[PDB]
RNA sequence: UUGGCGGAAAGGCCUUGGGUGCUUGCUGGCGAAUUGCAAUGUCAUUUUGCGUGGGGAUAAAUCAUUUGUAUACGACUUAGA
RNA sequence: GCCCUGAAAAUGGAUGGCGCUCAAGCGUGUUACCUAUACUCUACCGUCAGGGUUGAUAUGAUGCCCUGACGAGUAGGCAGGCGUGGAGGUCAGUGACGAAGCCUAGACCGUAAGGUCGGGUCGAACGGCCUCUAGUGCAGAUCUUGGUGGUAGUAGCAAAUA
RNA sequence: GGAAUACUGCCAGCUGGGACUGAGGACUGCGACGUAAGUCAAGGAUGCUGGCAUAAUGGUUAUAUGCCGCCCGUCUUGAAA
RNA sequence: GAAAUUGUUGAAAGGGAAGGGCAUUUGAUCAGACAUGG
């Protein structure tokens, strides 16, 4: 019921968004999440850095190129856990993933584009209060990922031009309320309002 | 009339199956704006269409459809059981579908 | 000899039928379809007219006519399985409707004077009901579609 | 031209072929029964072959129609057609491949006189 | 067409000025059938070969030869109008 | 009761995996939903049983017809059939105007063993039915004899002064 | 004090939507509705309409896609080993 | 003048085997019709 949906990743908790979004893709429908770097895992931080240290004990032993991708950027971390709810090896699971697209912070042309949340995923209303959890972008950085910073400067500087942008928008959809104010109470409004409108 | 659309829209998810064996026989389709069997009780019968492109063209045309009609509903959250003329051919599972309002008993 | 021949061969004779026991009982239109009710058509040439119910045919067909003047469509047989009932409802007192049947239909290119005619005779007093209730005539005019957002298992009509 | 019969149903259009044969050239696809101790298809297991058995049986009704629906009678010569002269709603007559061209025309003709089918016609036609 | 802004993958955004089509804001005059009671009836975007008229531009790489900062063979690195 | 300590092994790794924390965890309750070759109803194949019917009246009485029930299978028993060399009988069978044989993601019959046809190639003999007869049916036996591959343009073709 | 409602159960009470099937082939049977002649949903589907022709449709075959599928033969309590 | 095995031509598929089953898309190929006044 939209050509892309586009989910900030923001508030949400990696399983339960992990498991929508898996299955959006085997319906057909094309998803990209955006703000990957401020995705939540419960419980806390210590204990999922220790998680990743296990998964980092992993690799080949003959050829440790062969054996397990460890990926320590937080889209893509996401992108593991999305991964593993897919039938990824076979031809149907190919083509669910390739309409899927996960960025650390929003780079364009998503920037000037909605974006939504997915309730049942979304931490505050379901993770119980009280609960330890972690930032998916802390928990990144201290396994390697690079861009903690550059993500952080590149996001202020959108946030600036975004507030700017609604705040100009603000502004107009005064005018259009006001302006609306005499057509609001006219006859014409008066019908409407008969049927609902 | 910028919409003439006098269906409403659909996606093939999967051939009824169990875990480990499925059947092409029955397919299974999601309404869109159907959420309870209750609601789908309101669709079946009705007649659906999947509708795809082709080279050759056959009657002057390069577009093809395979007709079915949904038979019951499918669980409990809308999803709908449906035979088709044919077989949905499989590549489509996540494909669009088509979902008339005909036969109407409304 | 190729082969060597049967010792049987079956009766050419072809049997008759059992005489079936089953009778042509009248079908009873559902409750919505009531003459002068407005109709979406679902399927066919004119799918998407909203068109006006006349008269239940000996064939079970819907005798539907539009009014043509209004949106082209001309009196005409349309089956009602493929139909939405509206609740909007124009009266048929003044509208003849009594020669129509299903040998008028009958297939016997050109377009019949006679047609045309009726066309004329049963439309205008049909347009002059339709009149006396505003927006009607438009709304007739115009055609019916889904929109984003419509649930046709909800919809009033 | 033919009685009416139900509709001829088939029920394993599929050829059913030996195990194997496809594995090795030395092995046809004319069907044989597995008897090995372990083997999967004997046992049935999940994936492998149907074999064949006698609830596949077709239709006494239909058994033996070709879709034309008649039996086929094979037929060596005139006399041999002739067998069909009352029968012409039921059986339909296929020429033996060892008739020679002439000999053809003239079964031809004279099963055109009678009314039986051939299902072989453009036997060994000039043209 | 006047200004501007956008480099995270900006490749898009806001703006000024006229011109042109449409305008269902509203009131008229016509048209639609016979595609025959549903079935095939709105055209989308990708490549790629050709067709016309305009603007445009006018190289290199490989083999062979050669160096030994290189080399099992390929490969590498040099040189030659 | 749950939880924590007590709790040490060797390639990297398993509540099946992802992942899940007012659970997607533990105890309990209530509904709905998914799904077996099972159960219910129906068609068709076969097996077994019971029953009817050549009384004069065209074509199968080991037949035709009606009815009920039943179907797993190694070793193994029985039955009904498919196919091969030759033999008696018969179709006054097919054939140089093309026998047999071979090739053919061409066709048709049969649950199957198989049968049948077209087209191509070929060149001298061959087949159906009732019987008779066996040196009668292969995937295997480190089976026999022959023929052929991958290996592979590979190992190599460097002792004895040139 | 007089009710109602829930819960559980019964009706040879009335009705709507959807799905699969349509075996059989003159007549014999049991009934039902009729004052009647007749009618019927009573020992298995009919009726009306339409669609298809270098086609609708079906067989085969190749390939893709979903799910599933270990190497046969052998001896063995147990073999993909 | 079969098979194994091979060359060339044509069609097709091929992200650590290939082959098989049920099903259908797509391409190719093959059918069954048969008759009504002019």
């Given at each position: 019921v939209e050509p892309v949906v586009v989910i900030?990743?923001?508030?949400?908790?990696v399983g339960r968004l992990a498991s929508v979004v898996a299955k959006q893709l085997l319906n057909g429908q094309k998803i990209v999440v955006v703000r990957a770097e401020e995705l939540n895992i419960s419980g806390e931080f210590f204990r999922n850095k220790l998680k990743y240290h296990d998964f980092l004990?992993?690799?080949?032993?003959?050829?440790?190129?062969?054996?397990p991708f460890h990926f320590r950027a937080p889209s893509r971390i996401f992108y593991k856990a999305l991964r593993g709810m897919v039938?990824?090896?076979t031809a149907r699971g190919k083509a669910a993933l390739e309409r899927l697209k996960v960025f650390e912070g929003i780079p364009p042309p998503y920037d000037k584009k909605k974006r939504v949340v997915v309730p049942q995923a979304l931490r505050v209303l379901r993770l119980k209060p009280g609960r330890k959890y972690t930032t998916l972008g802390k928990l990144s950085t201290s396994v390697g990922w690079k861009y903690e910073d550059v993500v952080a400067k590149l996001e202020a500087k959108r946030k600036v031009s975004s507030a700017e942008y609604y705040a100009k928008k603000r502004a107009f959809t005064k005018k259009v309320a006001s302006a609306n104010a005499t057509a609001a109470e006219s006859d014409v409004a008066k019908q409407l309002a008969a049927l609902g409108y | 009339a910028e919409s003439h659309r006098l269906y409403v829209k659909g996606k093939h998810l999967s051939?009824?199956?169990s875990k480990r064996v499925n059947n092409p026989n029955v397919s299974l389709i999601k309404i869109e704006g159907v959420a309870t069997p209750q609601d789908a009780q309101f669709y079946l019968g009705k007649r659906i269409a999947y509708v795809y492109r082709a080279s050759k063209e056959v009657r002057g045309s390069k577009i093809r459809v395979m007709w079915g009609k949904v038979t019951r509903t499918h669980g409990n959250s809308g999803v709908v059981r449906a035979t088709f003329r044919?077989?949905?051919?499989?590549?489509?599972?996540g494909a669009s579908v088509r979902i008339f309002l005909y036969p109407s008993n409304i | 000899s190729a082969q060597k021949a049967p010792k049987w061969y079956p009766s050419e004779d072809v049997a008759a039928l059992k005489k079936t026991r089953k009778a042509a009982r009248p079908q009873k239109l559902r409750?919505?379809?009531?003459?002068?009710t407005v109709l979406i058509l679902?399927?066919?040439?004119?799918?998407?007219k909203r068109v006006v119910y006349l008269k239940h045919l000996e064939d079970n067909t819907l005798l539907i006519s539009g009014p043509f003047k209004v949106?082209?469509?001309?009196l005409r047989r349309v089956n009602a399985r493929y139909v939405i009932a509206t609740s909007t409802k124009v009266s048929?007192?003044?509208?003849?409707?009594?020669?129509?049947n299903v040998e008028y239909f009958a297939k016997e290119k050109e377009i019949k004077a006679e047609r045309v005619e009726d066309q004329k005779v049963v439309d205008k007093a049909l347009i002059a009901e339709i009149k006396?209730?505003?927006l009607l005539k438009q709304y007739l005019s115009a055609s019916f579609s889904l929109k984003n957002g419509d649930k046709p298992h909800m919809l009033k009509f | 031209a033919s009685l009416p019969h139900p509709?001829?149903?088939?029920?394993?259009?599929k050829k059913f072929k030996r195990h194997h044969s496809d594995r090795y050239?030395?092995?046809?696809?004319?069907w044989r029964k597995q008897k090995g101790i372990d083997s999967v298809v004997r046992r049935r297991f999940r994936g492998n072959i149907s074999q064949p058995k006698?609830?596949?049986?077709?239709?006494k009704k239909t058994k033996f129609l070709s879709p034309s629906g008649h039996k086929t009678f094979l037929v060596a010569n005139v006399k041999d057609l002739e067998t069909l002269t009352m029968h012409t709603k039921t059986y339909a007559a296929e020429i033996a491949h060892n008739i020679s061209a002439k000999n053809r025309v003239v079964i031809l003709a004279r099963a055109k006189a009678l009314g039986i089918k051939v299902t072989n016609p453009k036997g060994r036609l000039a043209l």
């Open positions: 900030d990743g923001k508030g949400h908790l004990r992993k690799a080949t032993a003959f050829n440790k190129t062969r054996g039938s990824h090896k | 051939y009824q199956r044919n077989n949905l051919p499989a590549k489509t599972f | 409750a919505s379809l009531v003459p002068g679902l399927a066919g040439r004119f799918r998407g949106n082209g469509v001309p048929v007192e003044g509208v003849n409707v009594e020669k129509f006396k209730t505003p | 509709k001829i149903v088939k029920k394993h259009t050239h030395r092995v046809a696809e004319n006698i609830g596949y049986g077709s239709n």
